[PDB]
């Protein structure tokens, strides 16, 4: 009933630092991330991030429900929101 999203700090750096979002239940979800202030995406496995904006975006292309996500600080660091959407 519902579905969730789950992303923990895999590795974290002075510039840059990586995200391991989740969801369980389905495969075909849509996970929107709300990246604060200008923060952008260098790097994305089992899964693609585009959407212009304030907002972001994230598909599922055919792999499974686990991808990762390379968030750049830019003057930030709070990792975004994943929501699960579609099921």
Do not use: H
Request: glycine content about 12%.
């Amino acid at each position: 009933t519902g579905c969730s999203v789950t992303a923990t700090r895999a590795e974290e750096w002075s510039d840059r630092f990586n995200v391991t979002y989740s969801v369980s239940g389905s495969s075909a979800w849509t996970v929107n991330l709300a990246l604060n202030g200008s923060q952008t995406i260098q790097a994305s496995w089992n899964a693609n991030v585009t959407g212009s904006g304030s907002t972001r975006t994230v598909t599922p292309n055919g792999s499974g429900n686990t991808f990762g996500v390379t968030v750049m600080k830019n003057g930030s660091s709070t990792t975004p929101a994943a929501t699960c959407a579609g099921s």
